[model samples]
Target: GSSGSSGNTYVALYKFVPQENEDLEMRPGDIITLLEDSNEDWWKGKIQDRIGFFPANFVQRLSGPSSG
Candidate 1:
C-alpha cells in the first residue's frame, strides 16, 4: 500500500459564497492551496488572505505544472 498523497493545488469550479464565518468564498477559475483534506465533503484551503473550509466538489484538483 502507498502512503496518502494528493494534489494540494486546486481551481475553483464555480463561485461559492461563504455561508458562515468558517467557510470560504471563491470565484470560478480562482486558484486555492489545499491545507487539509481529511473531510471528503469539505476541504480547507487558503486563498488571498483567508483560510477556511470549502466544499470539496466546488474545487477540482490541479495537475502538476509539468506538461505532457
Candidate 2:
C-alpha cells in the first residue's frame, strides 16, 4: 500500500475516541495507521512505535484533511 501523508490513499483513520486499556489501549482520539485489515476480523495497526490489534470497526477513517 502507498503510505502517503495526505489523502485517503493509504493513511489515516482517526480513532474517534475508541476507548482504552493497555495490551491494546487506543485513546479517545488516537491517530491509527492501519497496517493490516486482512481476513474477517481484528485488524492490525500502528500507533507511535507500537503495533497491536483492535476490533474490526474500532476506528473512523478520515473523510478529508484534519481539522479540530
Candidate 3:
C-alpha cells in the first residue's frame, strides 16, 4: 500500500558544514528531498531552494505521512 508522496523525505542526521565550494550545507535538523533515484553513498538533495550532493549517511529516510 503505497500512500505517500512520490518524493521521499529525509532528515539531516548531522550538520553539513561546507568544507569546500559547491557543497550543500544544512543544519543537523534540516530536511531534504532526495532528487534522484540512485541510492549511492553520495546522493543528490534539495533543501532551502538549494540542490547539491550530500552524504547518504548524513540523512535518514522518513517514512511517509503516518502516525503510529
Candidate 4:
C-alpha cells in the first residue's frame, strides 16, 4: 500500500533531448524539485508544471539546505 507524506524534495530531473528517441529524452544529470511521495508506491511529480508518476526507489532525499 502507498505510505508517505506530501512535501518538497529534490529529485533527478532528466532533461529531454530532441535528438534522442522519445524514451531517451530524459537525460541524466538534470535536477529538479518534486513533491515527495505521499505513499509507499510510486509518487506523482510535477516538472515544469508537467505532472507525471515515478517510483519512490528512483529518488534520493536531500539532507542539507532547503531550496525555496
Query: Among these predicted structures, which one has the highest TM-score?
Result: 1
Model 2, stretches more than 4 Å misplaced? 1-23, 66-68
Candidate 1 lDDT, tens digit per residue, 21-64?
89888999889988787889899988987768899898889876
Best-to-worst order by TM-score is: 1, 3, 2, 4
- Tell me the deviation in Å of residue 28 in model 3: 1.3
lDDT (10s digit) by residue, model 2, range 1-68 = 47755332123333423345433546555676766667556666677765566765656665677788
lDDT at position 48, candidate 4:
63
Please, what are the lDDT tens digits per residue for candidate 4 over residues 1-68?
15745455646544543342322222345444555456776555555644455555555555667789
Error of 4 at 38 (Å): 2.0
User: What is the full ranking by lDDT, best candidate first?
Assistant: 1, 3, 2, 4
Error of 2 at 10 (Å): 10
Instruction: Give the TM-score comparing model 1 with the true structure, all chains together.
Output: 0.79
Using all chains and alpha carbons, the TM-scores for the candidates as numbered come to 0.79, 0.52, 0.73, 0.46
Better of 1 and 2 by TM-score: 1
As a whole number from 0 to 100, the lDDT of residue 4 in candidate 3 is 40
Query: How accurate locally, in lDDT, is each candidate?
Result: 0.85, 0.55, 0.79, 0.50
Off by over 4 Å in 1: 1-7, 65-68
